[PDB]
Design a protein around this ligand. Structure first.
Ligand SMILES: CC(=O)N[C@@H]1[C@@H](O[C@@H]2O[C@@H](C)[C@@H](O)[C@@H](O)[C@@H]2O)[C@H](O[C@@H]2O[C@H](CO)[C@H](O)[C@H](O)[C@H]2O)[C@@H](COS(=O)(=O)O)O[C@H]1O
Ligand SMILES: CC(=O)N[C@H]1[C@H]([C@H](O)[C@H](O)CO)O[C@@](O)(C(=O)O)C[C@@H]1O
Ligand code: NA
Ligand code: NA
Length: 203
């Protein structure tokens, strides 16, 4: 005889093509113990467990144990996966977390955007470039801004790389004849650094 069901707090899970992700949901019951956590699409039934895409994974530690879902020490569900590079972008998936208390109460699924962040969350897939924000590097002084030579293009690409070590090693850095930088990430998405922040002349 428990009357309330476990409550969930999740978040805004933005994931990126080519990159791994890892988010956590916090679960608390009035009983202080939660015995089961399921993450699923709205389709199904009560015991449905279908979740798509298949690359979305979840895990929970310390299930079914007194006080593992208290306000002082919330139950935490790890939501993680690896987005493949061939995933469409424009794309988001609305999902549900269901938790179970010892008396059997299950989190109620409510199909409404007003629940996003709680037991309902959105997993938004974005392009790789949306994960990084390349930093303005060393200014590279060149002879002429309208005609960067090959070596000046290579020097600007090496300086951008030196300022941005977080950026995927496989990302390609190219510089044009007027000095604009193009960062092509592994999923072929693109970031571009203006020529006036990385290149200068004395004319
Ligand atoms: C109203 C209802 O029970 N229908 C379910 C659909 O959900 C409803 O339409 C959605 C477009 C969306 O507006 C939602 O708010 C509304 O409840 C459900 O569609 C799926 O809903 C997801 C979240 O609940 C999400 O928005 C998905 O985009 C949307 O496709 C359909 C589809 O599921 S299916 O039958 O399994 O394929 O289920 C209806 O029951
Ligand atoms: C990019 C895409 O196709 N996702 C659409 C999903 C999927 O149809 C189902 O989630 C897959 O089962 O439906 C809805 C949703 O989930 O929020 C909106 C979204 O536009
Ligand atoms: Na659906
Ligand atoms: Na970026």
């Amino acid at each position: 005889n428990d009357t309330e069901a476990p409550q969930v707090k999740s978040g805004d899970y933005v994931v990126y093509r080519g990159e791994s992700f890892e988010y956590y949901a916090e679960i608390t019951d009035n009983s202080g113990q939660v015995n089961r956590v399921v993450i699923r699409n709205v389709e199904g039934g009560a015991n449905s467990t279908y979740l798509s895409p298949n690359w979305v994974k979840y895990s929970t530690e310390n299930l079914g144990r007194p006080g593992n879902a208290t306000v002082q020490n919330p139950l935490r569900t790890r939501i993680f996966g690896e987005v493949p590079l061939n995933e469409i972008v424009n794309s988001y998936y609305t999902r549900y977390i269901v938790a179970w208390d010892p008396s059997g109460n299950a989190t109620q699924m409510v199909d409404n955007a007003n629940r996003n962040g709680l037991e309902r969350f959105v997993l938004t897939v974005k392009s790789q470039n949306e994960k990084y924000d390349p930093a303005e590097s060393s200014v590279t002084y060149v002879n002429n801004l309208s005609n960067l030579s090959t070596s000046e293009r290579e020097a600007v690409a090496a300086a951008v790389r030196a300022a941005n070590p977080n950026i995927p090693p496989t990302a390609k850095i190219t510089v044009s004849q007027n000095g604009t930088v193009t960062i092509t990430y592994p999923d072929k998405s693109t970031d571009t650094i203006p020529a006036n922040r990385v290149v200068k002349d004395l004319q």
